[model samples]
Target: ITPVSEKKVDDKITLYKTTATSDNDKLNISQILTFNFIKDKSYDKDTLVLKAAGNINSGYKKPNPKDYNYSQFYWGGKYNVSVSSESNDAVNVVDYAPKNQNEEFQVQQTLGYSYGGDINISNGLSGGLNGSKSFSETINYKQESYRTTIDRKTNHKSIGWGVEAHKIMNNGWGPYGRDSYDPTYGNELFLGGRQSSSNAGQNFLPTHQMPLLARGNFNPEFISVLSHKQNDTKKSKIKVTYQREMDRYTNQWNRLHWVGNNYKNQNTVTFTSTYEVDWQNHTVKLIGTDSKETNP
Candidate 1:
């Protein structure tokens, strides 16, 4: 047969104990008690109750001392996070054929992307410090290598060329994300800061705002691999900024390069000639057949 058990508590000098009875009328009991932590039940009163703590989705008014719950807290305890990332890649791939001089397709994949974020906090605070809870970010990246083959007597731009590639890199990034959390506030003390004119207010945000409480930023664990060599300006003005890539030829029928004055004013910007080169005929064009503008 199974055993039976019991337990209890009462007053400041609380007492709690347990007893159990098994087979054959055998019994086992355990118990403990305290004296007087409180002499009078009505005189000594101190109680503490912690209900919860997380992303509290309500209230922007004053922080009431009598109120102690999740609803009284701001996202200051919770939030939604997002990421903005990009990449630029290229490869010098070879084509194998029976008698080819320079048989390879210079392939390039240039890309860039970005996104925006916003933080909706309770109006517990106001102004730029509060309005500063939303912003976006842009990043720059690059990767490259050369692909080779071992089976063909000659190289071509098409498949059946080389099998592998040696990578070369000149890559970096500029910043990962941005935040609208301006943790500053104006004062209204000593009657000196009590005037109104487009900029007038009492700020408790300085002492109350928590860093990264309701801000936006990607998880650092996942960012290390994707955001190596990253950077950011104090203030971002453009959506995304990156230098132009080398000009790529779309028409593989011939090879030529267009060049003009390296520097020119808006009014007199012009080139000087018809660009052309001694083109060679081959089994397959060694240039990448993809269009020039692949990223936007």
Candidate 2:
């Protein structure tokens, strides 16, 4: 767990930096400029508009399909690889703060990423072999309950819910292979050719909630109701876990000739945070974090 710190990029923009890693140090993750809130009057005065952004760096290595191949299996061949990524941000205004302190805020914040890719076998040899493979990875952040007592006297204007930041990576491969056949039975033999795909950064948008306040006259301060600062001193409080798994689907050609096996791997990483929201200080302090990674 890395201590979260703030830096003023400008009068209207601020950047937050923090990091989390697994016990074995196999997974190194960092979130730079995790969240940003801006006040723009061009939109509705009663609504507090927010613009969020972040950079996610991962050190976990992706599993190579060729690495799982056995002896005599020629994994080297021509491969066409494609990579892409995406991200999104939005703010939803929930009803004004509840009147009762005991009442639940009834707000939700969800965050996560979806990543997947496809690989297909190409034909160039005399054999005429064909095959395809694909896989998907997803990580979701779930907050069951967000209960914070808001001052009913203040006459809060709106509560904004949105995502802080999310990202994903996709890799696709083109088919390349050759087919073979037995004259007597007309059975096809699989001629192996390599089709490789590499992963790259991508953008993603996961819905989340961030409390904001607008007092009388519709002048919103856009105070981050759930903002948190990371604490490095309490590294022990941060828990990080990682796992890797793969699923293999063998076709007739692959079983008979050890070639063109459909392989899929899924990777998942989750970060659980512990923090305290101080109503008096108007600040949220992150006490600990639990980051876990599982690749299939």
Candidate 3:
């Protein structure tokens, strides 16, 4: 068992699609197909909202229909606004004394505060009253998507949901630039392409506007800027737990664990499968004591 320590990793989390063995593969798996990302990672303490309208299909490697009709369900959409984090700060680390200043606090004789004295409390609680590190910011995201569909009776119907997406893409493209994508690739066609029966091509606006999960003072959220190379069992490390939904619909799940926060941890919620059987019917007994998902 690898200890959480010894494992070096950054604080920021990431999201993105898993490239497959072929370009055609993206028709079903590649690109940022029918998923929505809510801009709610900041601690600004507010609700995040976005609109998504689409349906899942059984086409293993291609969009459903004769080959271009939105893979299966046809969904039209409009602009939706999402108010990101309120004034909250995710990294609440307090501003420590400057490096040039050795001491963390200064004392005031009659409370005459200076940069290097300790503010002793009546109970002997030494130092300043402010000594807070930071946890991460929290975000609440919501999405809605719909698909125009044909029913078993061969009639037309529109099916949709207002919920969170179980998975998304976390790019290797940052200061890291363009990492090696598998020889297999995904283009924008899936988003607005004939890739499906639609033949839409990259028609959506907000050009190249994927919410990146990296760090920047200007950027709202970022994957911890730490590294995750390991050599031991305990020191300080990070790992992601994933599960594929076992239901009829293969939604991936980011199993909840005792790590990180809700904002950047969306990767922890999105999934396509699971190790355990669905508990929908009822709770069944378990024998083994563990499991793992199919993705990182």
Candidate 4:
């Protein structure tokens, strides 16, 4: 059982007393410390529900706020959290990885992948163009007297149809059973976004979209081991932004470029934003992409 609300609200006064008995003769006695602090976020209300997005099936339209549960509130990742102790805890406040590496994999006893993309139906069925791409890179480093192995993913590309978000918004998702759908790991909608365009019969998807592999499950309690640098929580994260130079559509995939072609000089542009959050140390660090949120 848990409290329904967070009593950690700012301006609230509280006391924490623990009984201590020291008989080392050279040791000290009981101590007390107090300070003012604000509580961190517990969850995100917006992005979670908007994900279902069944109405987008009707094309571009203003989303009704009243139709949603505005319960999302998450940290903007603006400031770093600081901690203190009465004695030297010898713990690195930053919880930096210090050149340590970790990896974990998810298993879908029943394995197969299925996906769908956007479509511009007002005009025509833009070719059922979708996007898919994998990235790779090698990172070599040394720590103290130990050699390190860091193979990072750096190149990714995908051609996705811009619509169809409604047609298959929830498909190909699974887990240990190979039939359960996980919003992040099990199955996914190629490019986590969509649009309803006219003139293009169907849709076109140019995916530069990044994935958040380290964020684990986007849920508040959704533990990410990578963020915690542990084995239990399979953590990984990557992000991407759409950079479009024009409004194009694809009704199908071209034999040469499976991603299809552009529409009227429109080369879909996208940015890949990636991050690795260490929740145990509460450290949110970025690893990839061209984003405005970058802080060195």
Candidate 5:
């Protein structure tokens, strides 16, 4: 049986941990859902409720024979989450309603082998001095040798819920899929990848607003096989940065008025990790991680 854990980070934030496993026991999933509460003077005696529920589907599949060796394997999954909100003040909340969406993430590893070699030929002649009239003999010999080289490669692709939410904020309601966002989006979290745009839309709604907004960091675990070779170790790193904008709104003239965007109120969290890759052994090891937060 899968177990769910709940924790209260504080009065305003609550976290729920959910796990799911495939029938074949080849795929396992762990998800953490975060909920943030906002207080509104407009609701004098009732509380607002925003619920997000969905399914975590995952499994493994055989890698394409044309892409790599037959031994390669591909693992992937998709998350389908739907959001809805309501107010207990005996009135319907006119807040935004995000269409149900699904995000797909995947990891793949490949192994390849190549052969190289060269051929050489030699000719020689020999004669016996004792036999003057003897015949001279000529011989030719051929030699060949080949070397085998191993090639290993791994790739990871993931789209976080927060990143999806950012897209929703920018692209209104419509039929959107995982490909809706650029392939390079959020790749900054990977080595030698691009950084997220500074003006990227906020993943969560501002607390000052009436609608409830929540966001969570999704960093899936890195899984790989370690190579037995320990002589050569390569340095690698991954940096993940989560950004959110803080906008304040005031109730006036019986309507909400924007009080300008506050850059100082922006929230930024960055996690940098150092690791080593052993190409010979086909393994990766983490050295350490540095995490920093600003304007929390």
Candidate 6:
């Protein structure tokens, strides 16, 4: 990754900047930093908080959703404040040092102490410090007249789950039964233009949302049916392992020691597709080696 490329200031605060990206994708991600000061007189300390959020355009392609490509970070600090001896400053004042000063300290020592605020720290570092991070944001996808909606927010704060739905419209122009070149093409010749079932134009949404594992031999109806089906889960665990093994032996005819293997630097990886479905509550859970959810 390269260094931050650009900086922007808002009311004497750094709010946005451009950061360089690694690899060949060559897209700069935008980063945002926010600061908030809280005066907790009851504790005799002022809390200084900082939060950062970042987003990249065109980050991931394929199996990854469009919304699952951003992240954020947060941090906070507190300091004790006391009234100035000269009795000047402290009505929400934020002054920056001149360029080339190369100083980040909030309080100065000389002309001493020319800060815009006069709240001095007696003793910093109050109790109760906490932090959190989010891995990815929610993803949304739309194609033609079909779209996905936010379905539910799970225990994983960063994971945004959604469901896909299709749009429908009808007029004198509508779809109907097709001739049976192949019955598997989902042609129902009986359901033609009729008074009772005239509007039964089954406009199945395209199944390009999910990655296809197999091809050709599968029936289109079976594929569509499988794509629309949703499974719920209570909980589950998955495990993955990789191994590189080699063997050494002595040649019987030549009586020479040699190392043998199927292929040089051969690598073998083992993966298990494990999950759970709970039909009662309509939930599907996916977990990795730990008890935590796999999405985050």
Give the TM-scores of the predictions, in the order they appear.
0.13, 0.28, 0.17, 0.19, 0.24, 0.20
Q: Model 1: runs farther than 4 Å from truth? A: 1-62, 66-72, 81-209, 215-296
C-alpha RMSD (angstroms) for model 6:
26.9
Expressed as tens digits, the lDDT of each residue in 24-143 for candidate 1 is: 111111111000111113222211000011121111233233321111211111111111112211111121111121213332111111111111212111322332322111111111
Q: What's the lDDT for all of these models?
A: 0.16, 0.23, 0.18, 0.18, 0.22, 0.18
Instruction: Estimate the overall C-alpha local distance difference test score of candidate 6.
Output: 0.18
Winner by lDDT:
2
Candidate no. 5 TM-score: 0.24
The TM-score of predicted model 3 comes to: 0.17
Span of ten consecutive residues with least summed lDDT in model 4? 45-54
* Per-residue C-alpha lDDT of model 4 across residues 1-296, encoded as one tens digit per residue: 11112233223221111111111111111111111111223211100000000010011112222322111111111011011111112211221111122222211011111111111111111211221211011111111111112213211211111210112121232111102234332222221122222112222222212112111111110000011112223333323122212222222222221222212322222233343422232222345444222111
What lDDT, from 0 to 1, does candidate 5 have?
A: 0.22
CA shift of 133, model 5, Å: 69
The best-first sequence of candidates by TM-score reads 2, 5, 6, 4, 3, 1
Q: After superposition, how far is residue 192 of candidate 1 from its true place, in Å?
A: 29
Query: How high a TM-score does candidate 6 get?
Result: 0.20
Which should have the higher lDDT, number 2 or number 4?
Answer: 2
In model 4, how large is the Cα lDDT of residue 111?
10
Error of 6 at 36 (Å): 17
In candidate 4, stretches whose alpha carbon ends up further than 4 angstroms from where it belongs are 1-235, 243-245, 248-265, 291-296
